[PDB]
Amino acid sequence: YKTKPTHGIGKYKHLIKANLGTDYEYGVLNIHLTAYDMTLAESYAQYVHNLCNSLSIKVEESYAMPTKTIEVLQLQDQGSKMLLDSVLTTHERVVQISGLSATFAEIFLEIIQSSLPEGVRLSVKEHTEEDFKGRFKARPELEELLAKLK
Amino acid sequence: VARKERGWRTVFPSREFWHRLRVIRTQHHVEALVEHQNGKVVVSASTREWAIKKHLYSTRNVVACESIGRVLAQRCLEAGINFMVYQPTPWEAASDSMKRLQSAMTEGGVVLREPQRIYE
Amino acid sequence: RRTPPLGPMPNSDIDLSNLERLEKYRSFDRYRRRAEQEAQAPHWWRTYREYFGEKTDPKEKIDIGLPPPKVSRTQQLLERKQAIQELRANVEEERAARLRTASVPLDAVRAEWERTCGPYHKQRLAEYYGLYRDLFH
Amino acid sequence: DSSRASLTRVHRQAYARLYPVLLVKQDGSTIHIRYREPRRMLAMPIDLDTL
Amino acid sequence: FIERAPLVPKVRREPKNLSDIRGPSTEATEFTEGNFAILALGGGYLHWGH
Amino acid sequence: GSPWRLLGALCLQRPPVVSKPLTPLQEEMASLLQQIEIERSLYSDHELRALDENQRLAKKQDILLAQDLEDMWEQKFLQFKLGARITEADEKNDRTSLNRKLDRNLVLLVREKFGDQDVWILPQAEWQPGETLRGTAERTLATLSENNMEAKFLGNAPCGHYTFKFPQAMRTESNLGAKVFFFKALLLTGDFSQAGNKGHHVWVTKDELGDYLKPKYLAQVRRFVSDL
Amino acid sequence: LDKARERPQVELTFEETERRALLLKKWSLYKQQERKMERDTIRAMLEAQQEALEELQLESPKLHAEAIKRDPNLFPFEKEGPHYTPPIPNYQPPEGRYNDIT
RNA sequence: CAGAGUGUAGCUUAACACAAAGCACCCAACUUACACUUAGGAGAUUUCAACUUAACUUGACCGCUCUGACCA
């Protein structure tokens, strides 16, 4: 009860709820993992995702890119027509992390590159300028946001 | 004829029982307890005691959990406790180690359902 | 009208500044274990234990039994550790333990139980029946 | 170490069998990848256009 | 420049029982950047003309 | 001013070029993963080709059989020669060329003469006014003798620091000691010229790093240099 | 979706199951050591970097303010993984054409 | 080089004895991945003696940390 000393003992809403990159911490980092092997990209992305949790780094989203199929043509023996040789498939995994300081970036980047498996390409870029931070939300999220708007 | 603490419908676990079999499985040890409604513990069986530890390859596997129930079932009969309730979570109920612990209690003569209170 | 609390609030220690980088529960079992810990602690407000819990005297109950035996922990611990390594060295026990087919002899377990911690369980069981409450007040 | 997350298997319920093959690059370097056919080596040719 | 009217009206979060001009002020009662200011010794409403 | 000289050290590292060979325990697991993979996968287009050909031959329009094409792949592979994981510099133990020890990281060491005594240390330059501490490490590359290398610096903060004092000979109130700051960078591409190699610089790993460095200097270096 | 591509499921003998089961227990301990070394390596770098910054501030607080700043030229960063064999100094790959399917 | 300080695997003011506990951690399965859960794995009292219970008290032995010597 409000007049009682135990007022507000049941409050929980402030416990649960209640990008811009500064000069000291990077805003959002997108880690691209290009490799001809599908399992190597999945495993390394899992390793990076588990590494961020151990190092107290928030992972925004871990998703995959559409597969790009590449046909490899080799010249025929003593001829001029290109004949089919092999089909190489490119697999990419993207692990999006945000909230990395510049000082801790030196250690974080060296650890991941040291454990980079063979045939796997590492590409880290920032795409917060591209924005497009729009995803489907649940009904309660819309209700709270619409409540603020009114 | 003794009244059970009915209620607590919106919370878990329930309190409508006389005795409860509560199993505590930690990182290294597995412990099963039989406690009364008022909170007092009747009998205990854990892997921390040397009696059960000296016969177990591992104190955190299914075998250790099954061995606790076989030891506890003998202690339940000696203590005179024959009926008790088991209130597991949906994942604990589906677990294999809890299934064999229930089997050990049933094969030991302990029924995991208390008889209904007599009102009239 | 408002009245200041007579004691620390339950969730007062939590800092709301860096709420995003705070470890959560993420599971029902982790919250339940912590929830039971605070439910067994004294509180300045009215609680279930205050009205339904069995009232006990704050004075510690006396012990009138035989003095506890004197056992050297260092020698006791070393002998127990040695037996574990021998049991785990055997490949048959590990195979049986991995196949969930191994079992312990119940008769031998109670023989050691009655000598080491049997009396303590009996005292706890006797207190549940209230034998000490009636026989020795 | 490069072996920290290198040893893995296909975590798919349904998939075709794959064989360990070598992918020789345009500079002679090779890499272990899994290919549909048991070709003991794969060499990527140099493109005529990129000359 | 002060706009005559807000671009989009918004419902206030204050309770409907409003004493907006009655009682001492509880905000903007101290200097922030400058050293001189006009102190209000009474309640009232300021419109676009003011 | 200050009685401690500010020297901007540089820690150039050569990333591994080849994958480190698997341990015997890893080899056993690698065979298990592939063995499990075959048992839990469907027939491929190549395997289904072979089974159908076996049935047709047993009963009795494909020119090339499944097994016959496999032999062609093997013949081409045996003709090509793979690169040597162990280079000639590994046999010659020439610690000046980047071609050696492709599996492990390499750390640059340069010998300098102080107090008429040669000491192997990391490249460094004195800090100057109107220049960041990181920029001091980048300047060290320009001071190297005929070097064509592009270094990738990670961040701006130093990766380590070491403190030493003059041994009561040149110790003065204006100059009491020095405090170096180590900056790590990645050697993208390039190598030194052929003018001076032996007495100029050497490339060694962390394990073989203690031979050249002093015990006290090595103590602060093995902290930010990983062996993964 | 066709069931004609399914392969026969050959049963695993007792020893085959026994070897795999014992092999997985040793692999769990081997991976624990790799994490232990990596955990200490990150801690070692973090402790040295934090200690180095403290010494920098005492000597010159201005240089401390620049070290903690971000590096715009740091990103993007591209690093290719190792290869099974080093590149051949003198190798001429055959001619061909590359076509990409999307 | 001495000087002090200090001692349970990562953490802990866990350890009365009945007992070296709890959590953190690691692998596999589930997940695109994380997480949950299921199923597994690795663990420790610096070492000695002191009337004995001494992880607990004393010193030694020992390691560690810190400050000077030492120092390019």
PDB file of C-alpha atoms in Angstrom, chain D residues 1-5 7 16-17 22 24-32 43-49 51, chain G residues 5 7 27 30-31 34-35 38 80-89 91-98:
ATOM      1  CA  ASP D   1      45.363 -21.568 -33.764  1.00  0.00           C
ATOM      2  CA  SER D   2      43.794 -22.384 -37.134  1.00  0.00           C
ATOM      3  CA  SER D   3      42.557 -25.654 -35.585  1.00  0.00           C
ATOM      4  CA  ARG D   4      40.430 -23.803 -33.008  1.00  0.00           C
ATOM      5  CA  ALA D   5      37.320 -24.008 -35.219  1.00  0.00           C
ATOM      6  CA  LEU D   7      37.406 -29.640 -37.395  1.00  0.00           C
ATOM      7  CA  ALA D  16      24.723 -35.286 -49.944  1.00  0.00           C
ATOM      8  CA  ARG D  17      28.036 -36.994 -49.217  1.00  0.00           C
ATOM      9  CA  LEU D  22      42.289 -29.686 -52.463  1.00  0.00           C
ATOM     10  CA  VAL D  24      44.695 -25.053 -55.700  1.00  0.00           C
ATOM     11  CA  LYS D  25      44.536 -21.293 -56.189  1.00  0.00           C
ATOM     12  CA  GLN D  26      45.937 -19.223 -59.057  1.00  0.00           C
ATOM     13  CA  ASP D  27      49.266 -18.802 -57.215  1.00  0.00           C
ATOM     14  CA  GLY D  28      49.786 -22.457 -56.239  1.00  0.00           C
ATOM     15  CA  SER D  29      48.328 -22.184 -52.736  1.00  0.00           C
ATOM     16  CA  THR D  30      45.970 -24.983 -51.720  1.00  0.00           C
ATOM     17  CA  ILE D  31      43.077 -25.223 -49.268  1.00  0.00           C
ATOM     18  CA  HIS D  32      41.030 -28.116 -47.914  1.00  0.00           C
ATOM     19  CA  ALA D  43      43.000 -25.893 -59.664  1.00  0.00           C
ATOM     20  CA  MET D  44      41.358 -22.559 -60.412  1.00  0.00           C
ATOM     21  CA  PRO D  45      42.460 -21.281 -63.844  1.00  0.00           C
ATOM     22  CA  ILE D  46      43.416 -17.667 -64.451  1.00  0.00           C
ATOM     23  CA  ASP D  47      40.785 -15.626 -66.281  1.00  0.00           C
ATOM     24  CA  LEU D  48      41.652 -14.422 -69.781  1.00  0.00           C
ATOM     25  CA  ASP D  49      39.747 -11.173 -69.189  1.00  0.00           C
ATOM     26  CA  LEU D  51      44.968  -9.967 -68.167  1.00  0.00           C
TER      27      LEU D  51
ATOM     28  CA  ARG G   5      19.069 -41.579 -52.838  1.00  0.00           C
ATOM     29  CA  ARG G   7      21.966 -45.245 -48.431  1.00  0.00           C
ATOM     30  CA  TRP G  27      38.125 -34.249 -27.335  1.00  0.00           C
ATOM     31  CA  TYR G  30      41.390 -31.044 -25.464  1.00  0.00           C
ATOM     32  CA  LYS G  31      39.016 -28.205 -26.374  1.00  0.00           C
ATOM     33  CA  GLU G  34      42.403 -24.427 -26.023  1.00  0.00           C
ATOM     34  CA  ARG G  35      39.805 -22.214 -24.351  1.00  0.00           C
ATOM     35  CA  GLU G  38      42.844 -18.320 -25.169  1.00  0.00           C
ATOM     36  CA  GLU G  80      42.618 -13.903 -45.724  1.00  0.00           C
ATOM     37  CA  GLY G  81      42.960 -17.261 -44.012  1.00  0.00           C
ATOM     38  CA  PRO G  82      46.004 -19.521 -44.230  1.00  0.00           C
ATOM     39  CA  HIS G  83      46.512 -22.033 -47.017  1.00  0.00           C
ATOM     40  CA  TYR G  84      47.611 -25.663 -47.018  1.00  0.00           C
ATOM     41  CA  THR G  85      50.665 -24.920 -49.197  1.00  0.00           C
ATOM     42  CA  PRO G  86      52.639 -21.705 -49.782  1.00  0.00           C
ATOM     43  CA  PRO G  87      52.296 -20.003 -53.177  1.00  0.00           C
ATOM     44  CA  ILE G  88      54.605 -21.163 -55.962  1.00  0.00           C
ATOM     45  CA  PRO G  89      57.039 -18.417 -57.073  1.00  0.00           C
ATOM     46  CA  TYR G  91      53.590 -21.144 -61.675  1.00  0.00           C
ATOM     47  CA  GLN G  92      51.436 -20.530 -64.747  1.00  0.00           C
ATOM     48  CA  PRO G  93      47.787 -21.562 -64.238  1.00  0.00           C
ATOM     49  CA  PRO G  94      45.802 -22.511 -67.353  1.00  0.00           C
ATOM     50  CA  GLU G  95      43.375 -20.182 -69.093  1.00  0.00           C
ATOM     51  CA  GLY G  96      39.663 -20.119 -68.415  1.00  0.00           C
ATOM     52  CA  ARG G  97      36.507 -18.100 -67.902  1.00  0.00           C
ATOM     53  CA  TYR G  98      34.549 -17.353 -64.727  1.00  0.00           C
TER      54      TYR G  98
END
